[PDB]
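B., you asked whether I could sanity-check this one before it goes into the benchmark set. Here's the sequence:
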Amino acid sequence: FSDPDFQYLAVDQTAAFDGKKNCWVPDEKEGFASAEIQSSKGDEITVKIVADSSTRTVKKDDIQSMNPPKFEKLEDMANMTYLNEASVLYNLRSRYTSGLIYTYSGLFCIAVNPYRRLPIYTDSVIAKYRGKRKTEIPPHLFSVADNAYQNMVTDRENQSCLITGESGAGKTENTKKVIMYLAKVEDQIIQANPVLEAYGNAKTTRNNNSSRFGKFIRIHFGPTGKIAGADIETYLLEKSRVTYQQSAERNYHIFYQICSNAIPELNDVMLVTPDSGLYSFINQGCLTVDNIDDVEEFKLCDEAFDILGFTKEEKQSMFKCTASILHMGEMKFKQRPREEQAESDGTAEAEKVAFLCGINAGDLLKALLKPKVTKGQNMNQVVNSVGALAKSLYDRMFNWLVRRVNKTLDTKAKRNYYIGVLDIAGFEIFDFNSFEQLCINYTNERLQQFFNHHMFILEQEEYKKEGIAWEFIDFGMDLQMCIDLIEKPMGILSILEEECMFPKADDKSFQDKLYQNHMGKNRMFTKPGKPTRPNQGPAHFELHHYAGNVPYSITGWLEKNKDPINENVVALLGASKEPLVAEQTISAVHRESLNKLMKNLYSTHPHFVRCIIPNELKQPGLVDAELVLHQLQCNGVLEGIRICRKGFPSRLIYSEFKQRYSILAPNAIPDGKTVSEKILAGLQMDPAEYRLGTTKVFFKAGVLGNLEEMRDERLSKIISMFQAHIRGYLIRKAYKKLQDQRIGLSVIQRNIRKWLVLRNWQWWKLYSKVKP
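And here's what the prediction gave me:
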């Protein structure tokens, strides 16, 4: 439209294209290659690669139909002739290398990570997307958000966006832009991310800012359609990162912010020396982070605590408890050759800890080396309960922190409906995978299957409900299994959960008790295979997850699932001086949180966002077709589009249908659901072009346009017929006048001729004369 605001948003296409020569042939580097057939030979087709101009043969049933230049960089792929793994990958990759990272796949959106900042989120751009209908303006995430708003409003129901994708794709960035969008059409809301991300994110090999907790944020709206409140829910924070961090990875962001000197004034409040590589608990893996300024992030994080409305004490309570942790791990120890119970190796660092938590350093190390009926601990039983404490504190801080930020957002204003946004942590496969990952992965599964349900299983159901017409289609997309292998009655987790309650148990009775149940009785469970990446640590079994095969090491899974902090120290802290500090298995608990989340989701009109990681190098604008193509597979994109093209997108409530299409067979209408049964029956309508429904009618594509055709026609006729009626009334009205005047004239004509001839009568003449 000439609008500068569309530089990286609007698509910028002819000749050399033979619909019978040109096709898609499998490739190892690009996934699919542009080929031009040369010679058939039964099944052995011989094509020429347009690129290098090399030649090769390919099974005939492995060629894919290419799309004509008519659909270059198409905005909506459901409108393409061919929706196959090679047409889709080509369209995306086409757009992507041109700045366009958003594309509709039918009813849901596709976002391909830019790995660079784009001027497409400005307020200038937001102005243009407001109240726009998806086809009206280029593809954009705003459009998805803007539309969910309109639906909640007009349709009067809750909306929801499940933004999915792999780890490092764009789930978080896009979730934030949605809120930022909905907020712009408030300040604290936007400001809750900086603090939650500082405490629940960390550098990882995959993501320099990896989210380590699940986030579901609902945004409430009032009677004038404006933001009237908001709440946040979080899930499974990586308690483990606190004390441990695999190489090339960092601990949570805060810890590094705290040791930068963004606010020197605070150094003495926390008792920290501005050196991160000084504290064991946070210098295991990485220290710095290409493109993350811990100095400035600390400032902004501090700045954000203010805007959130945090008293200075409150926000110093936070900072201290977390700096305290930086010390729990500095407390050295020793034995004392004899019994070993264990003795300390100083007390300097163990005091700073008791200090910051407002408890006696004495009473501490005491209830830590001989927990009370007493029961002393050895030299490791201690260093490990130290970690048990660090982890458990941080899990309470993070939880309290969220409760508090909701305090600031649960405005008691008036709520109508809302729009939630789900950002759950995605699939991730590392060199070594353990309980933490199974949990994240089980989580991500789960979700995918939701899309499968609501997308295929679902669509057809409604067709039935409304009572339209249709024949089923098996898209073969179910993971209930994988899901089942992990969650169901005797599943993986259920086995582990019943294994924790036994003090006798260990990493081997658990490992054996597992094969005992699923080896060979479920094909998703398979003995560990062979290395597909160097440094590939131990693996005890493999799971075939939607987006990958994961070799899981089950060592230490028993303690990881049953938490364990000296019930003693919990007493110390129970009555600590600091006001903050003073204030079921994990598996079962989480399984439950998750089930509850899912339950909350189902009651929604979902709009889906699909994130896609362009490559394994974290560099921008570079594509790895194999990987891309690979995602366009485990995510169900293509199929996700077939039904949009295949299916019955119409839908009408018999109440509004009877009112609009009764006038098409009124000589058959003596209940809104039967009246229509009649109308559409009268019209001798093909059972094909429509379907039943409980509360609504489903008309195949185009049909409704054609009904509005017949609808007009009749409405025009009828209007003519009433005009005919008016023509006939006026005519007949003036009928006497032509019969009446014919008489009324004969009177006058015959009755004047009389008075005329009577005056020409001698007698009358003479008579008239005498008169006087």
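One thing to flag: The CA atoms of residues 367 and 589 lie 28 Å apart. Otherwise nothing jumped out at me.
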